[PDB]
Amino acid sequence: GEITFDGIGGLTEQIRELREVIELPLKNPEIFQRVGIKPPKGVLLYGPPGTGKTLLAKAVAATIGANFIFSPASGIVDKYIGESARII
Amino acid sequence: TNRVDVLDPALLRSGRLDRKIEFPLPSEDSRAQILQIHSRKMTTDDDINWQELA
Numbered sequence: 001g002e003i004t005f006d007g008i009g010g011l012t013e014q015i016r017e018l019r020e021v022i023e024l025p026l027k028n029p030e031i032f033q034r035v036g037i038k039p040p041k042g043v044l045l046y047g048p049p050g051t052g053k054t055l056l057a058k059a060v061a062a063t064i065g066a067n068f069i070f071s072p073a074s075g076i077v078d079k080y081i082g083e084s085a086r087i088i
Numbered sequence: 089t090n091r092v093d094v095l096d097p098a099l100l101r102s103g104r105l106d107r108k109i110e111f112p113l114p115s116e117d118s119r120a121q122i123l124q125i126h127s128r129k130m131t132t133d134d135d136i137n138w139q140e141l142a
């Protein structure tokens with residue numbers, strides 16, 4: 001399913017700072033080429049529990065249209081030696 | 089659970105365990121009801137006045 005991207009509200013500023021990393025360098029790597037700066041990668045979302053840090057990621061992954069891997073961090077550990085190494 | 093102060097906030101909070109139901113000690117009147125459903129199973133008499141014991 002899909003969740004609207006205004007259905008997340010009150011945090012309209014954090015939605016725009018996340019798009020500065022994810023939306024922008026996908027379409028226009030020509031703008032980051034002008035200044036001469038290497039595009040940013042790697043975003044860390046952190047805050048008090050329940051603020052909506054998962055909701056923000058959920059909405060933006062149904063919207064953008066790029067291929068999307070979703071991974072519970074603890075779901076890729078395996079018993080066998082180094083099998084957890086092959087997954088990542 | 090019997091220690092709720094210990095569990096961290098990601099296990100609690102609404103949207104996970106919405107309701108947080110507290111259990112109070114049986115009140116002086118409840119003691120009367122309680123003693124009376126456990127005694128039915130064994131022999132009773134009319135000597136007993138459960139109101140006293142509660």
Ligand SMILES: Nc1ncnc2c1ncn2[C@@H]1O[C@H](COP(=O)(O)OP(=O)(O)OP(=O)(O)O)[C@@H](O)[C@H]1O
Pocket residue numbers: 007008009010011048049050051052053054055056098103
């Ligand atoms: N900013 C918000 N606007 C509207 N609803 C919100 C917002 N933040 C949270 N919610 C509500 O909270 C629900 C779940 O919150 P969410 O799971 O995003 O918290 P979380 O920060 O991911 O929790 P955790 O720390 O356990 O990962 C959503 O389905 C929504 O109903």
